[PDB]
Enzyme design. Structure first.
Site, PDB file in Angstrom:
ATOM      1  N   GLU A 185      47.168  52.725  58.585  1.00 56.72           N
ATOM      2  CA  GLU A 185      47.724  52.104  59.944  1.00 56.72           C
ATOM      3  C   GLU A 185      49.037  51.265  59.605  1.00 56.72           C
ATOM      4  O   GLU A 185      48.327  50.162  59.201  1.00 56.72           O
ATOM      5  CB  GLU A 185      46.848  51.645  60.939  1.00 56.72           C
ATOM      6  CG  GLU A 185      47.214  51.745  62.454  1.00 56.72           C
ATOM      7  CD  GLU A 185      47.933  50.402  62.526  1.00 56.72           C
ATOM      8  OE1 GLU A 185      47.080  49.600  62.947  1.00 56.72           O
ATOM      9  OE2 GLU A 185      49.355  50.264  62.196  1.00 56.72           O
ATOM     10  N   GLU A 198      58.286  44.054  60.747  1.00 56.17           N
ATOM     11  CA  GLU A 198      57.200  43.808  59.691  1.00 56.17           C
ATOM     12  C   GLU A 198      56.051  44.820  59.571  1.00 56.17           C
ATOM     13  O   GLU A 198      54.853  44.688  59.563  1.00 56.17           O
ATOM     14  CB  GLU A 198      56.296  42.600  60.276  1.00 56.17           C
ATOM     15  CG  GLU A 198      57.249  41.187  60.456  1.00 56.17           C
ATOM     16  CD  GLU A 198      57.033  39.874  60.711  1.00 56.17           C
ATOM     17  OE1 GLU A 198      56.063  40.243  61.706  1.00 56.17           O
ATOM     18  OE2 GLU A 198      57.859  38.879  60.595  1.00 56.17           O
ATOM     19  N   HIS A 241      48.400  48.069  72.026  1.00 56.36           N
ATOM     20  CA  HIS A 241      48.701  46.763  71.710  1.00 56.36           C
ATOM     21  C   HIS A 241      50.278  46.633  71.208  1.00 56.36           C
ATOM     22  O   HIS A 241      50.921  45.752  71.109  1.00 56.36           O
ATOM     23  CB  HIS A 241      47.733  46.257  70.569  1.00 56.36           C
ATOM     24  CG  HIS A 241      48.146  46.529  69.059  1.00 56.36           C
ATOM     25  ND1 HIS A 241      47.691  47.735  68.770  1.00 56.36           N
ATOM     26  CD2 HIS A 241      48.664  45.788  68.410  1.00 56.36           C
ATOM     27  CE1 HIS A 241      48.171  47.867  67.436  1.00 56.36           C
ATOM     28  NE2 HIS A 241      48.675  46.533  67.149  1.00 56.36           N
ATOM     29  N   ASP A 271      41.860  48.042  70.371  1.00 54.01           N
ATOM     30  CA  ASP A 271      42.904  49.008  71.027  1.00 54.01           C
ATOM     31  C   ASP A 271      42.087  50.250  70.656  1.00 54.01           C
ATOM     32  O   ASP A 271      42.403  51.011  69.503  1.00 54.01           O
ATOM     33  CB  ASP A 271      44.154  48.839  70.100  1.00 54.01           C
ATOM     34  CG  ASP A 271      45.200  49.918  70.641  1.00 54.01           C
ATOM     35  OD1 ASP A 271      45.053  50.847  71.563  1.00 54.01           O
ATOM     36  OD2 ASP A 271      46.368  49.642  70.245  1.00 54.01           O
TER      37      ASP A 271
HETATM   38  N1  LIG Z   1      49.978  47.700  61.515  1.00 57.22           N
HETATM   39  C1  LIG Z   1      49.585  46.664  61.314  1.00 57.22           C
HETATM   40  N2  LIG Z   1      50.465  45.488  61.763  1.00 57.22           N
HETATM   41  N3  LIG Z   1      48.395  46.286  60.997  1.00 57.22           N
HETATM   42  C2  LIG Z   1      47.502  47.231  60.514  1.00 57.22           C
HETATM   43  C3  LIG Z   1      46.579  46.718  59.601  1.00 57.22           C
HETATM   44  C4  LIG Z   1      45.304  48.087  59.254  1.00 57.22           C
HETATM   45  C5  LIG Z   1      44.114  47.381  59.336  1.00 57.22           C
HETATM   46  C6  LIG Z   1      43.004  48.635  59.325  1.00 57.22           C
HETATM   47  N4  LIG Z   1      43.389  49.685  58.513  1.00 57.22           N
HETATM   48  C7  LIG Z   1      42.745  48.965  60.636  1.00 57.22           C
HETATM   49  O1  LIG Z   1      43.265  50.198  61.011  1.00 57.22           O
HETATM   50  O2  LIG Z   1      42.000  48.591  61.452  1.00 57.22           O
HETATM   51  C8  LIG Z   1      47.283  46.501  58.263  1.00 57.22           C
HETATM   52  C9  LIG Z   1      46.658  46.045  57.334  1.00 57.22           C
HETATM   53  O3  LIG Z   1      47.454  45.971  55.710  1.00 57.22           O
HETATM   54  C10 LIG Z   1      47.119  44.693  55.007  1.00 57.22           C
HETATM   55  N5  LIG Z   1      48.326  44.439  54.062  1.00 57.22           N
HETATM   56  C11 LIG Z   1      49.548  44.498  54.260  1.00 57.22           C
HETATM   57  N6  LIG Z   1      50.247  44.754  53.227  1.00 57.22           N
HETATM   58  C12 LIG Z   1      49.522  45.151  52.432  1.00 57.22           C
HETATM   59  C13 LIG Z   1      49.750  45.569  51.224  1.00 57.22           C
HETATM   60  N7  LIG Z   1      50.983  45.537  50.657  1.00 57.22           N
HETATM   61  N8  LIG Z   1      48.629  45.949  50.338  1.00 57.22           N
HETATM   62  C14 LIG Z   1      47.537  46.004  50.956  1.00 57.22           C
HETATM   63  N9  LIG Z   1      47.134  45.671  52.239  1.00 57.22           N
HETATM   64  C15 LIG Z   1      48.206  45.142  52.794  1.00 57.22           C
HETATM   65  C16 LIG Z   1      47.246  43.748  56.210  1.00 57.22           C
HETATM   66  O4  LIG Z   1      46.557  42.577  55.771  1.00 57.22           O
HETATM   67  C17 LIG Z   1      46.251  44.572  57.159  1.00 57.22           C
HETATM   68  O5  LIG Z   1      44.905  44.291  56.944  1.00 57.22           O
END
Ligand SMILES: N=C(N)NC[C@@H](CC[C@H](N)C(=O)O)C[C@H]1O[C@@H](n2cnc3c(N)ncnc32)[C@H](O)[C@@H]1O
Ligand SMILES: N=C(N)NC[C@@H](CC[C@H](N)C(=O)O)C[C@H]1O[C@@H](n2cnc3c(N)ncnc32)[C@H](O)[C@@H]1O
Lengths: 324, 324
Positions: A107, A116, A267, A15
């Site tokens: 993000e 979620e 996305h 994306d």
């Molecule tokens: N908005 C979304 N649905 N997804 C975005 C990803 C961003 C991944 C990356 N920064 C990117 O921008 O490509 C979120 C990430 O956060 C992780 N995550 C979920 N809760 C978490 C928690 N409490 N503590 C640390 N990690 C957690 C997830 O496993 C995931 O890899």
């Protein structure tokens, strides 16, 4: 099996609208990040953390709870950045950093912004780890609503009337069925629209300033508000679309990452709230309502939407939705 | 909620290759059906039953176990055919017809032919209700296998090496990860290929004559066999595709409904069996094996595939798959 791990991260990095907005949103804050420390909440593959290092950050804590942290650690090693970007596994809520940080990048946005989403983790990290006056990237989010006419849905509603032409069997009697099935449910539908599907001026119905004290409590109680708009012309209205944008401060004008149907597709698409059946609107038909986005009763991370609306001279109606 | 009901039936009727093959396959048997009685096993919206009435059938029993029978009843009423087509709810295994029938029609095929298929219901109905010498439409099915190179997969495998060009971050170190994740699992993947993805002449590995006594027992024990072929040229082989065709007798040449990558696409696509990683093949590379399709251990309606194969001078390898 790790194919969902790879597919999720593939989709996000693929994306380009999302990933370029973050790259530019972060790089444009180089004056504030150069020599400073950053926490990346939910670092995934590490890409945003590396963007922060490109922007001049002295130290980035890349915190990631899922198994993809193994890949982030590899990517950081591979690019020779292990002395600037520290990949830490586990939830941000329990991570132990050696210092408070100058900035947080994340993000965190979900479908309909709040389904979620990682927002509560980002707000936890802000309170626990971000220095007073520190930088949050992005800094705020806004929610929009507009009446729409969904062409894909319109095609599906009409499908049964097209059978006779192809097969000699008349199934036009099944339009009521298709309508009840495709529109009569109470699920939020994630689907991408285009600008021609929008029937009026989009209305901002909420604004979330991530520094605002009490934001967690607002989210638990429900965010939203009233809206009003006026339709552009004759169309079969199928419901509402909601979408969001997030804003990164500049050093300069803010950079806005938008998920509007008028802007390049992401996305996240948009979140659609279908009426039980289509309603015909015309130029200057007034469409108004009140909308609230809040935690579902049974699962507090799943998004529920409470909607009351009025189309033209039709009576006010309630329809409440859940993401499923 | 009935949106899955509508979407499933929309997809099947929208599959013109499927639905036209049945219309023509049935109409071409008019001489055998005119004035005769038919059982439609799993009548759905009623479309095949109406095709039988178009072909001249005196009486059609349209038996349907799911709630869509309500829609079939409506469609039959609507087209004025209730005195020729009788829509009966519930499973065919317990339906009570007033007579044995002259013919059975059914669309029973699943992904990989046998995953969650209605074949055992059709065979039950044949034994219980079809007259000696009666007509089965379709009458037989054949299974094919061929080595393939999946361009979509190749793109996904290469994706991580393309990140640097767009974002300044080198993720080529994640190719091993992507390969293990996308190919190293043991799931059958349903995906549509084109003719250029096929690396050798397709080989028939099984033939199912639906009149064959003992076919149920063969299916329980496993159907399949050996295969051998020779590759056309240089390519990265990713695995095998399997697909099927079914055949309707003519009055005339048989009509064949094919799900081959060389033929017009259907909603069945093909079922792909990925190797753990790509293997390079060349012109005249021999590819051979043995394949068995059989009920999975825990759920007897889910398809499992046992595969042993040899690519060129590589040693023989086993990889067993399940649909999930
Ligand atoms: N908005 C979304 N649905 N997804 C975005 C990803 C961003 C991944 C990356 N920064 C990117 O921008 O490509 C979120 C990430 O956060 C992780 N995550 C979920 N809760 C978490 C928690 N409490 N503590 C640390 N990690 C957690 C997830 O496993 C995931 O890899
Ligand atoms: N090959 C498929 N996967 N689907 C094909 C549909 C065909 C529907 C229609 N004839 C068409 O061709 O459009 C199968 C129908 O059979 C019904 N069915 C499953 N078992 C059944 C059972 N034991 N007894 C009577 N019904 C059963 C299903 O509900 C479904 O409507």
């Amino acid at each position: 099996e790790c194919y969902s791990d790879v597919s999720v991260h593939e989709e996000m990095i693929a994306d380009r609208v999302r990933t370029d907005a973050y790259r530019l949103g972060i790089l444009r804050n180089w004056a504030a990040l150069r020599g400073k420390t950053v926490l990346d909440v939910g670092a995934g593959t590490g890409i945003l953390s590396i963007f922060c290092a490109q922007a001049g950050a002295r130290r980035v804590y890349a915190v990631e709870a899922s198994a993809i942290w193994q890949q982030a650690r590899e990517v950081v090693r591979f690019n020779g950045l292990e002395d600037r970007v520290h990949v830490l596994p586990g939830p941000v809520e329990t991570v132990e950093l050696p210092e408070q940080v100058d900035a947080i990048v994340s993000e965190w946005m979900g479908y309909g912004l709040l389904h979620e989403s990682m927002l509560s983790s980002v707000l936890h990290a802000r309170t626990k780890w971000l220095k007073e006056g520190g930088l949050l990237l992005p800094a705020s989010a806004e929610l929009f609503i507009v009446p729409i006419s969904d062409q894909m849905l319109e095609w599906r509603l009409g499908f049964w009337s097209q059978v006779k032409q192809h097969y000699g069997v008349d199934m036009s009697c099944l339009e009521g069925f298709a309508t009840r099935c495709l529109m009569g449910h109470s699920e939020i539908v994630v689907q991408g629209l285009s600008g021609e599907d929008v029937l009026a001026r989009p209305q901002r119905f909420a604004q979330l300033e991530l520094s605002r004290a009490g934001l967690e409590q607002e989210l638990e109680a429900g965010v939203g508000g009233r809206f009003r708009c006026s339709c552009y012309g004759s169309a079969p209205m199928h419901g509402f679309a909601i979408w969001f944008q997030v804003t990164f401060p500049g050093g300069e004008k803010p950079l806005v990452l938008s998920t509007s149907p008028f802007h390049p597709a992401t996305h996240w698409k948009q979140a659609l709230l279908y009426l039980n059946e289509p309603v015909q609107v015309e130029q200057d038909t007034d469409v108004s309502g009140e909308i609230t986005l809040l935690p579902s009763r049974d699962n507090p991370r799943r998004l529920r939407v409470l909607l009351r609306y009025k189309v033209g001279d039709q009576e006010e109606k309630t329809k409440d939705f859940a993401m499923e």
